[PDB]
């Protein structure tokens, strides 16, 4: 083995001196044994004189100059494969669920190159989530980046768990959930709610592997935890040929941890204080999330917007990579419509006739037009009553309300908390149902026959039962 010695401890930054020509390459992981276990330093610079400057993944308090350091010979290596499913993992790849070691056969570096240009997919395509509103009005990109907007009280967690369930059932792909710099309390709540829902199942098979770097972690760990999660997902892509999900909550704190790390290394901060490496630091994460010949990794990224400023460099840089957006809104929740996805703020680059086909594009465009016209009429409808508008306006208002109710869906995960059986609706039937609704084939049906149902077949069944 190769061993150096600590020579400077400044905050989370540690300098290590090695004997001649023994130097570890940048991004290599160096291990120091302490009473609290291993402390991992990631090499960031070569300072000459056989000295390297490194970022500490854990608290440096208690380090002494001359403390010997062992080079692991490669970047931070984390376990991969199905043995990670249902486990909670920290940035350095150690379990933090106290269920014992992660007995995976393989371990993979968290730093790796994106697929070459020749390996990219030549064509964009849809990943059906089994959720009517998402697959119709904001279709997800297979191997793309989807920005998720919302907060507390809008069902974000149950929506995420429904994505995890639906992708697993429909496509067989597992999921990886990464908590980048978010509250420890919310991570515990997610773990508990996932055990209740059954996406985590300690006695049997489970659908999601969890990686957490909480707010209390040093800046370096909050930076690298996203790459740890991404690295777990990339294994399910490359070696098992799956269409994996990679949830990242929150990407803004990936950016913020990168900013803090850049500041600690003494680099001159860029505009409005962010790291000078902002764009390429984001790219190194985002460009690994892509479709390849064997599979794909589709990323759902909860994105915070500081000061509600969509022009701020952090959200501005993040939106360059997003192929679609899903906007959970409390307003829609107050209408009693779940998953509460805003039908009009949610947008997708792929909602284009050449990608989804002209039929799907036509249906989605007409649904958007109907909802938009109804939204424009709403105030005068309230003031004058629905009957005061023209016959065509009244028709479109009724159809808009029926469509809006029809966009609700009972989730298989929420069934635990509500008893209502869940529904997974594939895209062809969704398009057929909304097409038939737009053509007035079911205009005689009462509104709440469309509420919390699957495809149009369930609409017919529920209308029959309500007529009986």
């Amino acid at each position: 083995p190769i061993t150096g010695k600590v020579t400077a401890v400044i905050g989370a930054i540690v300098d290590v001196h090695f004997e001649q020509s023994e130097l570890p390459a940048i991004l290599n992981a160096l291990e120091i044994k302490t009473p609290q276990g291993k402390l991992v330093l990631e090499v960031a610079q070569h300072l000459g004189e056989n000295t390297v400057r490194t970022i500490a993944m854990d608290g440096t308090e208690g380090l002494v100059r001359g403390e010997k350091v062992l080079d692991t010979g490669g970047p931070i290596s984390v376990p991969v494969g199905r043995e990670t499913l249902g486990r909670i993992i920290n940035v350095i790849g150690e379990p933090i669920d106290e269920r014992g070691p992660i007995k995976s056969k393989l371990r993979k570096p968290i730093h790796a190159d994106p697929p070459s240009f020749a390996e990219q997919s030549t064509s964009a395509e849809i990943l059906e989530t089994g959720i009517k509103v998402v697959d119709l009005l904001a279709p997800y990109a297979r191997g793309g980046k989807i920005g998720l907007f919302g907060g507390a009280g809008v069902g974000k967690t149950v929506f995420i768990q429904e994505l995890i369930n639906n992708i697993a059932k429909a496509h067989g792909g597992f999921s990886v959930f990464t908590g980048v710099g978010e509250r420890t309390r919310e991570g515990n709540d997610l773990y508990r709610e996932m055990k209740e829902t059954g996406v985590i199942n300690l006695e049997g098979e489970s659908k999601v592997a969890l990686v957490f770097g909480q707010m209390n972690e040093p800046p370096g760990a909050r930076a690298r935890v996203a790459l740890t999660g991404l690295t777990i997902a990339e294994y399910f892509r490359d070696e098992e040929g799956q269409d994996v999900l990679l949830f990242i909550d929150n990407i803004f704190r990936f950016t913020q941890a990168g900013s803090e790390v850049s500041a600690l290394l003494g680099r001159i901060p860029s505009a409005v204080g962010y790291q000078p490496t902002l764009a390429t630091d984001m790219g190194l994460l985002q460009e690994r999330i892509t479709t390849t010949k064997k599979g794909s990794v589709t990323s759902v990224q909860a994105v915070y917007v500081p000061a509600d400023d969509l022009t701020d460099p952090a959200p501005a840089t993040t939106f360059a990579h997003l192929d679609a957006t899903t906007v959970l809104s409390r307003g829609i929740s107050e209408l009693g419509i779940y998953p509460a996805v805003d039908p009009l703020d949610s947008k997708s680059r792929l909602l284009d006739a050449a990608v989804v086909g002209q039929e799907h594009y036509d249906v989605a465009s007409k649904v958007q037009e109907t909802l938009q016209t109804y939204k424009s009429l709403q105030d005068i409808i309230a003031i004058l009553g629905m009957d005061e508008l023209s016959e065509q306006d009244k028709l479109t208002v009724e159809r808009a309300r029926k469509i809006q109710r029809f966009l609700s869906q009972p989730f298989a995960v929420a069934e635990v908390f509500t008893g209502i059986p869940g529904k997974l609706v594939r895209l062809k039937d969704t398009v057929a149902s909304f097409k038939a609704v737009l053509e007035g084939k079911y205009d005689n049906i009462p509104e709440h026959a469309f509420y919390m149902v699957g495809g149009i077949e369930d609409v017919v069944a529920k209308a029959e039962k309500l007529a009986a």
Binding site: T7, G11, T60, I88, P219
Partner: protein, 480 residues
């Protein structure tokens, strides 16, 4: 040992000290102490706890061997201590159960439990609309002289009800942290707590304005280390940081005088990691880990109400919610001046007392409607009857939530008042005398319906028959 190379700005560079640990304490020959924040290949950057007049070049420095730590245990209850746990009230030595480091890892993902018990803030507004749960970390954020410390101090004073009892599972021990406050204010706080007999369960960790920057930096961490003793031994604790803006200022002083790279607003890059490291130690522990908890109420001061500032943004991000105090409401006579629209507790209803949850559920809706309709009061000549009645009800609800300082109300005293307000019995009462109504109504209950108050206190729920009896009592009073 080591030899001082240079001294200035409260920083001492020392040659030697080869074996010193990062953040270890060192003792200078003059007796002043410091801590080794910077370890460098040929020198150590110590930050001094005293004035640098006490240190001069060539002086010999002694290594203590101890990373910064503080005494902990129940023996601190009723004592005032500095950031290092030295008593400053002038009474006897601090008896301690042990000694614990200032900085330690917060409890991980697994040992925690969802917050499910109330912190009984004796303020009608906070208790009804933005409740706090044990283990929650709730920001108190506001402008200069808006009553922030008043809210925290009322929360501390209200515990007098349960801390006299025998059940350690209900008793809530309080730690108050004075950062950058003038010593006179801390002395008056101590006298206020002794006046209400609240010191027998309180601890005050004071790093006042003139005390060196490192002590103001350490005080929140060491006080949290005091609270964690109660947390880990199965007891319940409450820690008030008053206030984190001044701790951030002290850390900025340390970082800039150490010439560490600045950041936004000249703060060090990782200033987020200061308050996240500090606040994530608030937790509710599961039954396996001892069931204890540590509630945190960090105070934050916003210049001109600017919440977009760097430190307010960081703390708002880190905490579970905020109680927002606005000076405009304070001037109007709405005191403790909580802005209900901006105040949100994300843990929220789960922590609330069930009896209070039952009645206060609609109070939120009515106050929201009143906030939307408020602009119409200046156009009263033509009000839609809906808007008129909404205004009439919201005005009286807002008037009812006013509360005098140092006057916390028990839960069974809040429930009747909010019940009467919500159910509209106050509409027949002139606004100017709502304050006369409340104190009268309670005095009526505690003499004519004390059974209802006792039942609400004991059971914590409004059963249907009990609720009907409460309605009957309310109407029996309002008739006179």
């Amino acid at each position: 040992t080591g030899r001082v190379l240079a001294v200035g700005d409260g920083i001492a560079r020392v040659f030697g000290l080869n074996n010193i640990q990062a953040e270890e304490l060192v003792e200078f020959s003059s007796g002043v102490k410091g801590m080794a924040l910077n370890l460098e290949p040929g020198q150590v950057g110590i930050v001094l706890f005293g004035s640098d007049r006490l240190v001069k070049e060539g002086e010999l420095v002694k290594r203590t061997g101890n990373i910064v730590d503080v005494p902990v245990g129940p023996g601190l209850l009723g004592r005032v201590v500095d950031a290092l746990g030295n008593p400053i009230d002038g009474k006897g030595p601090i008896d301690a159960a042990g000694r614990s480091r200032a900085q330690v890892k917060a409890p991980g993902i697994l040992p925690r439990r969802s917050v499910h018990e109330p912190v009984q803030t004796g303020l009608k507004a906070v208790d009804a609309l933005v409740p706090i749960g044990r283990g929650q970390r709730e920001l108190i954020i506001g402008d200069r002289q808006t009553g922030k410390t008043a809210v925290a101090l009322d929360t501390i004073l209200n515990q007098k009800r349960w801390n006299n009892g025998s059940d350690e599972s209900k008793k809530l021990y309080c730690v108050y942290v004075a950062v950058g406050q003038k010593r006179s204010t801390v002395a008056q706080l101590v006298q206020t707590l002794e006046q209400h007999d609240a010191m027998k369960y309180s601890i005050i960790v004071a790093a006042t304005a003139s005390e060196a920057a490192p002590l103001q930096y350490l005080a929140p961490f060491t006080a949290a280390s005091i609270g964690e003793w109660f947390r880990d031994n199965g007891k319940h604790a409450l820690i008030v940081y008053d206030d984190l803006s001044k701790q951030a200022v002290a850390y900025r002083q340390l970082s800039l005088l150490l010439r560490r790279p600045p950041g936004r607003e000249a703060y060090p890059g990782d200033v987020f990691y200061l308050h996240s490291r500090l606040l994530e130690r608030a937790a509710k522990l599961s039954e396996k880990e001892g069931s204890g908890s540590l509630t945190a109420l960090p105070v934050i001061e916003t210049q001109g109400g600017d919440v977009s500032a760097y430190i307010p943004t960081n703390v708002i991000s880190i905490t579970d919610g905020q109680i927002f105090l606005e000076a405009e409401l304070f001037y109007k006579g709405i005191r403790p001046a909580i802005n209900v629209g901006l105040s949100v507790s994300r843990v929220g209803s789960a922590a609330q007392v069930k009896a209070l949850k039952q009645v206060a559920g609609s109070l939120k809706l009515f106050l929201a409607q009143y906030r939307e309709v408020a602009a119409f009061a200046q156009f009263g000549s033509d009000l839609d009857a809906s808007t008129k009645q909404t205004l009439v009800r919201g005005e009286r609800l807002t008037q009812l939530l006013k509360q005098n300082q140092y006057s916390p109300l028990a839960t069974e005293e809040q429930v009747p008042l909010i019940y009467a307000g919500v159910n509209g019995h106050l509409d027949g009462i002139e606004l100017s005398r709502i304050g006369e109504f409340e104190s009268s109504f309670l005095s009526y209950l505690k003499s004519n319906h004390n059974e209802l108050l006792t039942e609400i206190r004991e059971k914590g729920e409004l059963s249907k028959e009990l609720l009907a009896s409460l309605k009957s009592a309310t109407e029996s009073f309002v008739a006179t």
